[PDB]
Each structure stands twice: as C-alpha cells, then as structure tokens.
Design an enzyme around this catalytic site. Structure first.
Site, PDB file in Angstrom:
ATOM      1  N   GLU A   1       0.805  -1.214   0.000  1.00 40.26           N
ATOM      2  CA  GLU A   1       0.000   0.000   0.000  1.00 40.26           C
ATOM      3  C   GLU A   1       0.840   1.267   0.000  1.00 40.26           C
ATOM      4  OE1 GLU A   1       0.923   1.596   3.033  1.00 40.26           O
ATOM      5  OE2 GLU A   1       2.085  -0.242   2.858  1.00 40.26           O
TER       6      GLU A   1
ATOM      7  N   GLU B   1       4.598  -0.401   1.442  1.00 37.77           N
ATOM      8  CA  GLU B   1       4.722  -0.486  -0.017  1.00 37.77           C
ATOM      9  C   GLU B   1       4.742  -1.920  -0.541  1.00 37.77           C
ATOM     10  OE1 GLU B   1       7.995   1.737  -1.590  1.00 37.77           O
ATOM     11  OE2 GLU B   1       7.531   3.570  -0.482  1.00 37.77           O
TER      12      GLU B   1
HETATM   13  O1  LIG Z   1       0.334   6.634   9.062  1.00 37.02           O
HETATM   14  P1  LIG Z   1       1.633   7.166   8.545  1.00 37.02           P
HETATM   15  O2  LIG Z   1       2.420   7.782   9.655  1.00 37.02           O
HETATM   16  O3  LIG Z   1       1.370   8.201   7.492  1.00 37.02           O
HETATM   17  O4  LIG Z   1       2.488   5.966   7.896  1.00 37.02           O
HETATM   18  C1  LIG Z   1       1.952   5.204   6.816  1.00 37.02           C
HETATM   19  C2  LIG Z   1       2.535   5.733   5.502  1.00 37.02           C
HETATM   20  O5  LIG Z   1       3.994   5.556   5.441  1.00 37.02           O
HETATM   21  C3  LIG Z   1       4.334   4.449   4.602  1.00 37.02           C
HETATM   22  N1  LIG Z   1       5.214   4.869   3.424  1.00 37.02           N
HETATM   23  C4  LIG Z   1       5.711   4.098   2.408  1.00 37.02           C
HETATM   24  N2  LIG Z   1       6.461   4.730   1.498  1.00 37.02           N
HETATM   25  C5  LIG Z   1       6.510   6.049   1.878  1.00 37.02           C
HETATM   26  C6  LIG Z   1       7.156   7.181   1.302  1.00 37.02           C
HETATM   27  C7  LIG Z   1       7.026   8.433   1.930  1.00 37.02           C
HETATM   28  C8  LIG Z   1       6.252   8.572   3.140  1.00 37.02           C
HETATM   29  C9  LIG Z   1       5.606   7.450   3.721  1.00 37.02           C
HETATM   30  C10 LIG Z   1       5.726   6.163   3.090  1.00 37.02           C
HETATM   31  C11 LIG Z   1       2.988   3.855   4.220  1.00 37.02           C
HETATM   32  O6  LIG Z   1       2.946   3.245   2.929  1.00 37.02           O
HETATM   33  C12 LIG Z   1       2.046   5.030   4.249  1.00 37.02           C
HETATM   34  O7  LIG Z   1       2.164   5.857   3.070  1.00 37.02           O
HETATM   35  O1  LIG Z   2       4.583  -2.193   8.752  1.00 33.01           O
HETATM   36  C1  LIG Z   2       4.382  -1.397   7.803  1.00 33.01           C
HETATM   37  O2  LIG Z   2       4.075  -1.850   6.650  1.00 33.01           O
HETATM   38  C2  LIG Z   2       4.497   0.114   8.049  1.00 33.01           C
HETATM   39  C3  LIG Z   2       4.850   0.599   9.388  1.00 33.01           C
HETATM   40  C4  LIG Z   2       4.927   2.011   9.508  1.00 33.01           C
HETATM   41  C5  LIG Z   2       4.713   2.938   8.501  1.00 33.01           C
HETATM   42  N1  LIG Z   2       4.381   2.366   7.248  1.00 33.01           N
HETATM   43  C6  LIG Z   2       4.268   1.019   6.970  1.00 33.01           C
END
Ligand SMILES: O=P(O)(O)OC[C@H]1O[C@H](n2cnc3ccccc32)[C@H](O)[C@@H]1O
Ligand SMILES: O=C(O)c1cccnc1
Ligand SMILES: O=P(O)(O)OC[C@H]1O[C@H](n2cnc3ccccc32)[C@H](O)[C@@H]1O
Ligand SMILES: O=C(O)c1cccnc1
Lengths: 346, 346
Positions: free
Chosen positions: A171, A314
């Site tokens: 995601e 991701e």
């Molecule tokens: O609830 P949160 O604190 O926002 O954390 C969840 C987020 O961080 C991860 N995440 C994955 N790739 C990223 C690139 C930049 C920033 C975040 C990213 C998750 O995929 C989602 O976008």
């Molecule tokens: O476990 C995950 O996939 C995760 C944890 C923190 C922030 N984003 C993704």
C-alpha cells in the site's frame, strides 16, 4: 460477491500428503529444514499450484489512496507524498520497486483513491479523491467497499491467467496506519493505546492525539467486529480495502499471497473475518516494527519469517520474502533422496 | 598466525559515515528500512568491499570431519554418513547445494578430517581420520589446531583474489553438536543441560547421556575459556576449527562472513575469543532450533534475521540469507533520492 466468497477452494489434502512423504525422503534428517518444509507443504495444498510447490511469475500489488483523517494531524508526511511516491512507483525508484526487481517480480501500482489528478501509468480504480475522515464518520459506504472488493478480486485472479502464481500485497497512503490501528483494535478487542504506533516517524509527543483519534473513530462509527466489510467501510480506507481484495482474489484463484507489514495485517484480519477460507492461502513475510504488530499477528496466528525491524510498507517486506518461497520449492524439487544414497535415518 | 590476527583491519568509519548519509536521503522515511539499513552500513565499513555495500561472487565453505566422541552414542546418524553426504556435496544434491544454487553461490567442500578414504572432487586438508574422543581426552593438539587455522585462513582469503566478496560457513560431521555444545558451555559459562540439544534427531531419552558426555569432556580436558585455541583443540573438532579459520580468513581479508546455525555459533564464539577484531565482519543468518542457540547468540550479541526453525547445518542457513545481503546493496544503489522528488520528511 457472495458467489466469490462461496467459491473459494479448500486446500488439497491429497497433494499435501504426497508432499510431506516426498520431503521426508529427501537427503536430510527428517524435519531438519523446519518451516521451509511446512511452507512447501502449504503451497502444495493450493489448487492453483497444480499439486506441487512451484513459483511462476511473481507480482506485487500496491494499493494507493489518501485518507481524510490526515486532517486530524496523525501523519507528518505531506499529503501530496502519496501522489508523488505513486508516480515514483512507475519509475522503479521506490523501495518496493528495487526489492521486487531483486526478486524478479513485477510491481502493479493501483490507484484506488488518491486525492490528486490521475497518474499516467498507474492502474485506475479510484473510488474517490481520498476517503472520508474516519474521526467524524465513515470512510466510505458499504456499497463502495463491496464494489472495490469485487473489482480488485477480479483483477487479481485475472493476472493468474497471465502466469502469475505468487502474489505480494502492498500500500501507499499518508496517515493509513491510523485506520489500520483502528481496525486492529476492533478485530482484536485491544485498547487503542496498545496498537497505535509511530507510523512514518510520527513524533513521540503527538502519539496521544493519534490514540484519541482512533478512539473517536470507533466510538462515532460503532463498527461491528463480526462484520469485516462493516469495519472496513467505517474505519478502514480504500487502500486497506484494496489489499483485502487481493487476498480474496488470490484465495478464490487458489494461489498464495505474501503479506507485508502492519497495514497488511489489518487487511488480513478483515479478509479472514469475511472469509475464513482465505487463511490457508496467506503467507507472512516479516515482523513489522509498528507497536501493534505483535497483537495483530497473534490474532492471525502467524509467525513472520523475517525480523528486519522494517516499517516502510509499499509491499517491500513481501518482495523481500519471495526468495524464501522459491527456496522451499527448490528444496522440494532439487534435493536428492536418502534411498538413492542407501542412507537410513530414524 | 600472530601476524594474521595482528593484521585484521578495523572497520572504515569514514565509508560508513558516507553510507549512512546516503541511506538517509533515499526515497523513504528515514530509518524505515530498519536492519536492512544497518546491514548496508556494516558492509560499507568492510575494507575488502571498496567503501560501499556490494556483492560480487559468493561462496559457501563446508568443513567436513568425523569425531571420536561418536563412539559415546551421542549421535543416531551412522558415522559413514559424513563421507557419503560429503560426496553428495560434489553432486549438488544436498540441502546447502540446492539453496546455494538458488542464491547463485558456489559450494566448496573441504575435508579437514573425514574418517574414510579421500573423496575425489573434495578439497583435501585432512588433519587425521577423525579427531580424538573428547570424552576421554583432547580432540587434537594445539599445534594441529593452529596449523589448520592458518591453512583454512589462507585458502579463504585466497578466494577473495578470485572475485569472492561474500562468504558463508558450513559443516558436516556426525556427532558434531556435542563438541559444539561443550564449547558453548565453556565460553558462555552455562551448564551443559542448558545448551545440549537433540542435534540430528537424537531421541529424547538419550539426551541425558549426551549431557554427561559433555560434562566429562570439560572435566577431563579442563579447557581455558580465555584461550579460544585451547578450547577448540581440547573439546572442539576439525570441522569446528575449520569454520573458525574461515572467519579469521575473511576478517583478515576485510570481507563479510555469513554464519549458519548452532555449529557456526560455537566457532564464532571461539573466533571472537581469539580475535575480537573479527566481530565486525560476522553476519547472522537464521535462528537455529537447537536448544543452546539462544544462549550462544546472546553472548555473540547477535539477532538472526531468519526464523525458520532450521536445524540441518551444512551452511544451508547462510546460503538462504545471501539474498538478504544482496537486497541491502540493491536498496543502497538503486533507490531514488528524496531531494530529486522535492519531497521533504522530518
Ligand atoms: O500513518 P503514517 O504515519 O502516514 O504511515 C503510513 C505511511 O507511510 C508508509 N510509506 C511508504 N512509502 C513512503 C514514502 C514516503 C512517506 C511514507 C511512506 C505507508 O505506505 C504510508 O504511506
Ligand atoms: O509495517 C508497515 O508496513 C508500516 C509501518 C509504519 C509505517 N508504514 C508502513
Ligand atoms: O550431533 P548430531 O546429532 O550428529 O548432528 C550434527 C550433524 O547433523 C547435521 N547434518 C547435516 N546434513 C546431514 C545429513 C545427514 C545426517 C546429518 C546431517 C550436521 O551437519 C552434522 O553432520
Ligand atoms: O543449527 C544447526 O546448524 C544444526 C542443528 C542440529 C543438527 N545439525 C545442525
């Protein structure tokens, strides 16, 4: 959708029995390869795999969407990062892209609700420009959740017809660890404080607000724990629904799905609540560094293979574990047999 | 040998600093890739890697030898299996061969003391036809231990000149979990009962005898915990010494070495006792299902990446973790940068 859930195949016990017998006769002390052996047997029971642990083409599906709860100050990443990082996905520069390339898997970027203009190259399945703010109401309608589930399900099983035999779920969506934590709290029955984490580097001071937001979401929406679709639509998100859909699609297709991190755990809890028959097809990857990981995993009764203290999301963890699935297949098909060496072991 | 231990290079802090800075600027929340990031930094500090996390050719070294303590009834596998399985190694049908092939690594089978006629295709470095029975005396002389250490060390670093940048260590020898347990008890100061396991499917009833044998070995030989070479020669084995030699050789060569299971843990304890400078080059792979694994790992202050309940040995766990090392390198070299996307994260 009822048809879908109804037609999910049960595991093939016959194939699994032949698998166990074969593994037991390999050039090694019985059971010495531990979980790698149990994994091979699990795969053999999946109908889509033709009675044997094997891996053809691999695909990682990344569901992207924005959340209205971002406005509650639960995420420190700019909301625009969702759209920006989604574009980077098409350029192969993100974490899941690099790890997927290392595993020889293709990444499919799917937009199920990004709050921005359509991104060229990204699969378009957007429900709306971001979901509703769960703190003051539901994320979406039950209808929208069911429709997305069906759409994602079909897409997933459709890839199977193209040669894909192993799926990975992922995601992308700023602030999604909040609804994820909410769902975990509801399905698990644990208090918010016990399952709310720092997500993408949320300052320790701002943790209390995130916990309050989760509680508000639950109190206001009153999601029914016994109804996975109800929970998803009320305190979930488009991306979370999408991940659940990949799980239901692969299960119906009788194929294995690799979970990723914390976000995937919440989706897997929902999927198993909606259809218990999905469980046999799920494969854990790593143990997320998110606080609620242990609780979520316990309820899924899963023990991750990888302990990397990872927390990127991701679908990066799923891609990282694909080589492990391939190793179980290699063991199964390439090892020699004890009998052929005239070796006898208790 | 003194020269060897003296010339082991310290880690390159300068390269590690540049590595951390680069990783921090990648397209992801800082530190979100957890242990994969720390692993990349560790590699960058290894002089043999040219200031950057990289992996060229990979090799798994399997040290084979027989033990006199087999006569004490501590192993249920026929003593001949050592020689038979060693030959199978040259045919690529064993567990480490299949997993190594999956990782694209070459397996080097080394005979350091098999009690049988020489096996064609196997590297000949045999000290004797099996080591002495540690229950009634020492496994070998201090001279024999030091000589093997030097020989294996040179061979290991010699491969580096052929393009090898990543090593894996393994063994083969019926009854070797007994001397392994003895060394763990001595180095750790734990009671035998706490670190003696079932090895290759030893019946639960026969556990008590194995524990008594270990205690006898220690009481009779009186190994000095502060002298790693003393411990190895007295209650160790040729295979265990060989593994230690691979560790010293790679460290001197400034290259990384992947540990395997319980047998490797005992060798790593010895190596670190002999030369603390070796520690920075060691990389854990999986968490062995052997009872004494937790205790041994705690003293090495290592946390394995893989939890597979594996207990085969042969270097199978090391081969299985090689893809993880390559992933850290991929992350380091292939991910995009935040600055290039105009993305700013705390
Ligand atoms: O609830 P949160 O604190 O926002 O954390 C969840 C987020 O961080 C991860 N995440 C994955 N790739 C990223 C690139 C930049 C920033 C975040 C990213 C998750 O995929 C989602 O976008
Ligand atoms: O476990 C995950 O996939 C995760 C944890 C923190 C922030 N984003 C993704
Ligand atoms: O102390 P023990 O109970 O004998 O267990 C240690 C032995 O089992 C493992 N081992 C690895 N490959 C094997 C093939 C056949 C039998 C054993 C094997 C180890 O490599 C070693 O040979
Ligand atoms: O951990 C290992 O490497 C192991 C454990 C039991 C038997 N042989 C090897």
């Amino acid at each position: 959708l009822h048809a879908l859930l109804r037609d999910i195949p049960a595991p093939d016990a016959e194939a699994m029995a032949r698998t166990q017998q074969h593994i037991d006769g390999l050039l090694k002390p019985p059971g010495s390869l531990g979980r790698l052996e149990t994994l091979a047997v699990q795969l053999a029971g999946m109908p889509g795999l033709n009675g044997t642990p094997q891996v053809g083409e691999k695909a990682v599906l990344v569901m992207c969407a924005d959340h209205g709860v971002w406005d509650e100050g639960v995420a420190v990443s700019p909301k625009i990062v969702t759209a920006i990082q989604a574009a980077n996905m098409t350029r192969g520069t993100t974490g899941v892209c690099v790890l997927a390339a290392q595993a020889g898997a293709k990444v499919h970027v799917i937009d199920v609700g990004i709050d921005a203009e359509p991104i060229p190259g990204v699969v378009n399945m957007r429900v709306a420009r971001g979901c509703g703010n769960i703190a003051v109401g539901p994320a979406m309608s039950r209808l929208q959740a069911e429709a997305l589930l069906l759409e994602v399900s079909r897409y997933t099983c459709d890839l199977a017809q193209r040669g894909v035999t192993l799926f990975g779920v992922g995601e992308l969506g700023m602030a999604n660890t909040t609804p994820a934590a909410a769902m975990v709290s509801v399905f698990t029955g644990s208090d918010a404080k016990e399952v709310v984490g720092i997500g993408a580097n949320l300052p320790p001071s701002r943790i209390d607000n995130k916990v309050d937001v989760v509680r508000r979401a639950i109190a206001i929406n009153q999601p029914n724990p016994r109804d996975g679709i109800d929970v998803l639509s009320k305190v979930g998100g488009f991306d979370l629904v999408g991940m659940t859909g990949v799980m239901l699609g692969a299960a119906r297709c009788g194929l294995p799905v690799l979970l990723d991190g914390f976000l995937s755990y919440s989706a897997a809890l929902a999927a198993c609540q909606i259809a218990p028959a999905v469980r046999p097809y799920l494969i854990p990857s790593h143990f997320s560094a998110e606080k609620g990981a242990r609780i979520a995993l316990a309820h899924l009764s899963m023990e991750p293979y990888l302990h990397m203290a990872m927390r990127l999301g991701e679908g990066s963890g799923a891609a990282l574990a694909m080589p492990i699935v391939e190793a179980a297949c290699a063991m199964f098909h390439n090892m020699g047999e004890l009998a052929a060496s005239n070796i006898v072991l208790p």
